[PDB]
Amino acid sequence: MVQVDGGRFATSDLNDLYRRLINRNNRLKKLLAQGAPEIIIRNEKRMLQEAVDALLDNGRRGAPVTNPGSDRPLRSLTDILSGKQGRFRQNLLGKRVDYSGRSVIVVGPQLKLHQCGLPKRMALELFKPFLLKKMEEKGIAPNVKAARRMLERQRDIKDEVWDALEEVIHGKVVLLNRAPTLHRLGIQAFQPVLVEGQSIQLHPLVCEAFNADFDGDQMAVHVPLSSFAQAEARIQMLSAHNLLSPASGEPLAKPSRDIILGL
């Protein structure tokens, strides 16, 4: 039961399902102490079963329990666990993640196969914790707390912080992903090249494995944090190290379109 922004209350449907249960149980206790006839005690008992039933799996047996003046079935424990929106397939086999971003992708012909264009403004957020430490080693900020305050206002950002970020991302890779991720090359690793501008630049040769075009496609960026993750990205996931289809064994990164045309 949480107060939202406006001071209003928002609450989970389970609270209403429990309340029905508690009310019916308590009334049953009272009817017993007062010696009600069996018809009355029987009605209460069968209503109690239904309250337990809606709590555990609402809609499973009989008409689904609803909040008043709404057709929406209350969301029971079974509904929470199961289905596309259920606990397993939503919060357990997949999650939202930190250190991630997204933008429109644009072709970057000048890139080497292991590279991508990464907007400087994106990299400053994605690498922000790393950037704070570097801003302390260089006298650029007194300490980590002060450095963060400097990045908060956009007019407070000076040019030495951009060089600091260049030092931070040195040799590190980022992950690019474009949905749908149909096979494992929907994610590949690239060493980022900071760019002005708000678009991610993708190498022409990887467009096929990603099924990426430039008609307005977007991609997601991820930062592997640990030495282990970074090692995994550069060895196993680097674009240049995956040149052949895991399916057919034929070349995946290969000439197409303009490249074929010119040659």
Partner: peptide, 8 residues
Amino acid sequence: SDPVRQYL
């Protein structure tokens, strides 16, 4: 099958 109808 209908709890109300049953009680009635």
